[PDB]
Protein backbone atom coordinates (compact mmCIF):
# COMPACT_ATOMS: atom_id res chain seq x y z
CA UNK A 1 0.00 0.00 0.00
CA UNK A 2 0.31 1.64 2.44
CA UNK A 3 -3.25 2.86 1.56
CA UNK A 4 -5.36 5.65 3.08
CA UNK A 5 -4.64 6.65 6.69
CA UNK A 6 -7.10 4.66 8.77
CA UNK A 7 -7.91 7.46 11.21
CA UNK A 8 -10.85 9.89 11.28
CA UNK A 9 -11.00 13.31 9.57
Amino acid sequence: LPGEEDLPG
Epitope: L1, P2, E4, E5, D6, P8
Partner: antibody
Framework: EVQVVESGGGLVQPKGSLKLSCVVS????????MNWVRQAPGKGLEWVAR??????????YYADSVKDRFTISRDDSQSMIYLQMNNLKTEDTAMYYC??????????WGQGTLVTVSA | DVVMTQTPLSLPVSLGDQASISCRSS???????????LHWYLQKPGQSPNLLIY???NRFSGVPDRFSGSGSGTDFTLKISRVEAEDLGVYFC?????????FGSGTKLEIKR
Protein backbone atom coordinates in the same frame (compact mmCIF):
# COMPACT_ATOMS: atom_id res chain seq x y z
CA GLU B 1 6.60 -4.06 -0.66
CA VAL B 2 6.74 -0.53 0.71
CA GLN B 3 10.26 0.44 1.81
CA VAL B 4 11.11 3.28 4.17
CA VAL B 5 14.65 4.78 4.54
CA GLU B 6 15.63 7.61 6.95
CA SER B 7 18.84 9.64 6.69
CA GLY B 8 20.60 12.74 7.99
CA GLY B 9 21.50 11.50 11.46
CA GLY B 10 24.81 12.22 13.14
CA LEU B 11 26.66 14.17 15.82
CA VAL B 12 25.27 17.63 16.65
CA GLN B 13 26.16 20.07 19.46
CA PRO B 14 23.51 21.06 22.05
CA LYS B 15 21.37 24.04 20.92
CA GLY B 16 22.19 22.99 17.33
CA SER B 17 19.96 22.09 14.42
CA LEU B 18 19.49 18.97 12.28
CA LYS B 19 17.27 18.05 9.32
CA LEU B 20 16.31 14.40 8.89
CA SER B 21 14.98 13.03 5.61
CA CYS B 22 12.87 10.06 4.69
CA VAL B 23 11.96 8.37 1.43
CA VAL B 24 9.09 5.94 0.87
CA SER B 25 9.48 3.50 -2.05
CA UNK B 26 7.08 0.81 -3.46
CA UNK B 27 4.09 2.95 -2.48
CA UNK B 28 0.93 3.89 -4.38
CA UNK B 29 0.49 7.68 -4.49
CA UNK B 30 0.84 9.86 -1.37
CA UNK B 31 -2.56 9.33 0.23
CA UNK B 32 -1.29 8.20 3.69
CA UNK B 33 0.07 9.81 6.85
CA MET B 34 3.74 9.67 7.82
CA ASN B 35 5.17 9.71 11.33
CA TRP B 36 8.44 10.03 13.19
CA VAL B 37 8.94 7.91 16.29
CA ARG B 38 12.13 8.00 18.39
CA GLN B 39 13.81 5.72 20.90
CA ALA B 40 16.42 6.89 23.38
CA PRO B 41 19.07 4.30 24.32
CA GLY B 42 17.50 1.64 26.59
CA LYS B 43 14.12 3.40 26.66
CA GLY B 44 10.70 3.01 25.05
CA LEU B 45 9.03 4.31 21.93
CA GLU B 46 8.20 8.03 21.79
CA TRP B 47 5.94 9.34 19.02
CA VAL B 48 7.29 12.68 17.85
CA ALA B 49 5.40 14.04 14.82
CA ARG B 50 2.68 13.25 12.26
CA UNK B 51 1.88 14.73 8.87
CA UNK B 52 -1.34 13.77 7.17
CA UNK B 53 -2.10 13.40 3.45
CA UNK B 54 -3.04 16.16 1.01
CA UNK B 55 -6.70 15.04 1.39
CA UNK B 56 -6.38 15.81 5.09
CA UNK B 57 -4.88 19.23 4.35
CA UNK B 58 -1.38 18.03 5.22
CA UNK B 59 -2.27 18.49 8.91
CA UNK B 60 0.65 18.30 11.33
CA TYR B 61 0.85 17.20 14.95
CA TYR B 62 3.70 17.05 17.45
CA ALA B 63 4.58 15.60 20.83
CA ASP B 64 4.55 18.35 23.57
CA SER B 65 8.21 17.50 24.28
CA VAL B 66 9.24 18.64 20.77
CA LYS B 67 6.46 21.09 19.77
CA ASP B 68 7.85 24.36 18.42
CA ARG B 69 11.43 23.03 18.32
CA PHE B 70 10.59 20.47 15.61
CA THR B 71 8.81 20.98 12.29
CA ILE B 72 7.62 18.22 9.91
CA SER B 73 6.84 18.50 6.19
CA ARG B 74 6.58 16.45 3.03
CA ASP B 75 7.37 16.70 -0.70
CA ASP B 76 4.99 14.31 -2.46
CA SER B 77 6.49 14.90 -5.94
CA GLN B 78 9.43 12.85 -4.59
CA SER B 79 7.68 10.89 -1.82
CA MET B 80 10.01 12.57 0.71
CA ILE B 81 9.29 13.32 4.41
CA TYR B 82 11.32 15.82 6.49
CA LEU B 83 11.92 16.46 10.15
CA GLN B 84 13.63 19.76 11.05
CA MET B 85 14.91 19.83 14.63
CA ASN B 86 16.02 23.09 16.24
CA ASN B 87 17.58 23.91 19.63
CA LEU B 88 18.51 20.26 20.19
CA LYS B 89 18.93 19.03 23.77
CA THR B 90 21.07 16.12 25.01
CA GLU B 91 17.69 14.41 25.72
CA ASP B 92 16.88 14.45 21.95
CA THR B 93 19.56 11.78 21.55
CA ALA B 94 17.77 8.78 20.03
CA MET B 95 17.29 6.50 17.08
CA TYR B 96 14.76 8.32 14.85
CA TYR B 97 12.39 6.20 12.77
CA CYS B 98 10.25 7.26 9.84
CA UNK B 99 7.01 5.21 9.96
CA UNK B 100 3.98 4.92 7.66
CA UNK B 101 0.39 5.18 8.76
CA UNK B 102 -1.85 4.11 5.92
CA UNK B 103 -4.37 1.28 6.29
CA UNK B 104 -2.26 -0.15 9.13
CA UNK B 105 -0.91 1.77 12.16
CA UNK B 106 2.85 2.32 12.19
CA UNK B 107 3.16 -0.61 9.77
CA UNK B 108 6.38 0.09 7.82
CA TRP B 109 9.51 1.37 9.58
CA GLY B 110 12.94 2.36 8.36
CA GLN B 111 16.04 0.86 10.04
CA GLY B 112 16.27 4.28 11.76
CA THR B 113 18.76 7.16 11.72
CA LEU B 114 20.88 7.84 14.83
CA VAL B 115 21.02 11.37 16.26
CA THR B 116 23.53 11.97 19.03
CA VAL B 117 23.27 15.40 20.68
CA SER B 118 26.55 15.94 22.55
CA ALA B 119 29.35 18.43 23.27
CA ASP C 1 -1.42 12.45 27.33
CA VAL C 2 -3.42 9.21 27.32
CA VAL C 3 -1.29 7.07 29.64
CA MET C 4 -0.81 3.49 28.41
CA THR C 5 -0.06 1.18 31.37
CA GLN C 6 1.29 -2.30 30.63
CA THR C 7 1.30 -5.16 33.15
CA PRO C 8 3.68 -6.83 33.89
CA LEU C 9 6.76 -4.92 32.68
CA SER C 10 8.84 -8.10 32.78
CA LEU C 11 7.16 -11.41 31.88
CA PRO C 12 9.10 -14.67 32.47
CA VAL C 13 7.83 -17.45 30.24
CA SER C 14 8.56 -21.11 29.61
CA LEU C 15 8.70 -21.84 25.86
CA GLY C 16 5.53 -23.66 24.76
CA ASP C 17 3.39 -22.01 27.44
CA GLN C 18 0.68 -19.33 26.98
CA ALA C 19 1.50 -15.70 27.81
CA SER C 20 -0.82 -12.72 28.40
CA ILE C 21 0.04 -9.04 28.61
CA SER C 22 -2.34 -6.38 29.97
CA CYS C 23 -2.61 -2.87 28.56
CA ARG C 24 -4.81 -0.22 30.17
CA SER C 25 -5.49 3.31 29.00
CA SER C 26 -6.14 6.36 31.29
CA UNK C 27 -9.30 7.04 29.25
CA UNK C 28 -11.48 5.18 26.75
CA UNK C 29 -9.94 4.44 23.39
CA UNK C 30 -13.34 4.21 21.70
CA UNK C 31 -13.71 6.93 19.10
CA UNK C 32 -17.11 8.57 18.24
CA UNK C 33 -16.93 6.70 14.90
CA UNK C 34 -17.15 3.37 16.80
CA UNK C 35 -13.53 2.40 16.20
CA UNK C 36 -11.04 1.54 18.92
CA UNK C 37 -7.53 2.48 17.77
CA LEU C 38 -5.47 0.24 20.06
CA HIS C 39 -2.47 -1.69 18.60
CA TRP C 40 0.39 -4.09 19.58
CA TYR C 41 4.05 -4.12 18.45
CA LEU C 42 6.91 -6.54 19.08
CA GLN C 43 10.45 -5.17 19.18
CA LYS C 44 13.33 -7.63 19.08
CA PRO C 45 16.80 -6.40 20.18
CA GLY C 46 18.50 -4.16 17.59
CA GLN C 47 15.42 -4.02 15.34
CA SER C 48 12.57 -1.72 14.40
CA PRO C 49 9.21 -2.68 15.98
CA ASN C 50 6.92 -4.99 14.02
CA LEU C 51 3.14 -4.55 13.98
CA LEU C 52 1.30 -7.58 15.37
CA ILE C 53 -2.32 -6.58 15.99
CA TYR C 54 -4.21 -3.38 15.02
CA UNK C 55 -7.59 -2.03 16.14
CA UNK C 56 -7.76 -4.36 19.19
CA UNK C 57 -7.99 -7.73 17.43
CA ASN C 58 -6.99 -7.56 13.74
CA ARG C 59 -3.85 -9.55 12.95
CA PHE C 60 -1.43 -7.85 10.51
CA SER C 61 -0.47 -9.79 7.38
CA GLY C 62 2.29 -12.32 8.13
CA VAL C 63 1.64 -12.48 11.91
CA PRO C 64 1.13 -16.08 13.19
CA ASP C 65 -2.30 -17.01 14.55
CA ARG C 66 -0.79 -17.72 17.98
CA PHE C 67 -1.04 -13.96 18.62
CA SER C 68 -4.49 -12.65 19.47
CA GLY C 69 -5.75 -9.29 20.77
CA SER C 70 -8.89 -8.48 22.75
CA GLY C 71 -10.41 -5.99 25.19
CA SER C 72 -12.61 -2.93 24.98
CA GLY C 73 -12.75 0.63 26.28
CA THR C 74 -9.70 1.02 28.52
CA ASP C 75 -8.81 -2.63 29.00
CA PHE C 76 -6.82 -4.74 26.54
CA THR C 77 -4.96 -8.04 26.45
CA LEU C 78 -2.46 -9.61 24.06
CA LYS C 79 -2.24 -13.41 24.28
CA ILE C 80 0.42 -15.67 22.78
CA SER C 81 -0.90 -19.22 22.80
CA ARG C 82 2.42 -21.18 22.79
CA VAL C 83 5.48 -18.94 23.11
CA GLU C 84 8.37 -19.57 20.70
CA ALA C 85 11.99 -18.35 20.86
CA GLU C 86 11.08 -16.00 17.92
CA ASP C 87 8.47 -14.33 20.18
CA LEU C 88 11.03 -13.09 22.76
CA GLY C 89 11.43 -9.32 22.86
CA VAL C 90 9.67 -6.17 24.09
CA TYR C 91 5.92 -5.81 23.49
CA PHE C 92 4.38 -2.34 23.13
CA CYS C 93 0.74 -1.37 23.14
CA UNK C 94 -0.12 1.77 21.17
CA UNK C 95 -3.13 4.10 21.05
CA UNK C 96 -3.91 6.36 18.10
CA UNK C 97 -7.50 7.37 18.99
CA UNK C 98 -6.10 10.48 20.74
CA UNK C 99 -3.32 12.91 19.75
CA UNK C 100 -0.66 12.86 21.13
CA UNK C 101 -0.24 9.20 20.05
CA UNK C 102 1.10 7.29 23.03
CA PHE C 103 2.78 3.95 23.74
CA GLY C 104 2.91 1.68 26.73
CA SER C 105 6.25 1.35 28.54
CA GLY C 106 6.96 -2.09 27.06
CA THR C 107 6.66 -5.61 28.44
CA LYS C 108 9.78 -7.70 28.06
CA LEU C 109 9.10 -11.35 27.40
CA GLU C 110 12.00 -13.35 28.88
CA ILE C 111 12.93 -16.98 29.68
CA LYS C 112 11.83 -18.36 33.06
CA ARG C 113 14.43 -20.45 34.92
Amino acid sequence: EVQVVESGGGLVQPKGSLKLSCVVSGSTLNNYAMNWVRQAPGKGLEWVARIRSKSNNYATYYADSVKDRFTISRDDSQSMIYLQMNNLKTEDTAMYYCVTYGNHPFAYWGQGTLVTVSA
Amino acid sequence: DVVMTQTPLSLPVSLGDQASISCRSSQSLVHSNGNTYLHWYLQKPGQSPNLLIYKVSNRFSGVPDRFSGSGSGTDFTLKISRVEAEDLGVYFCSQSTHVPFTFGSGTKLEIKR
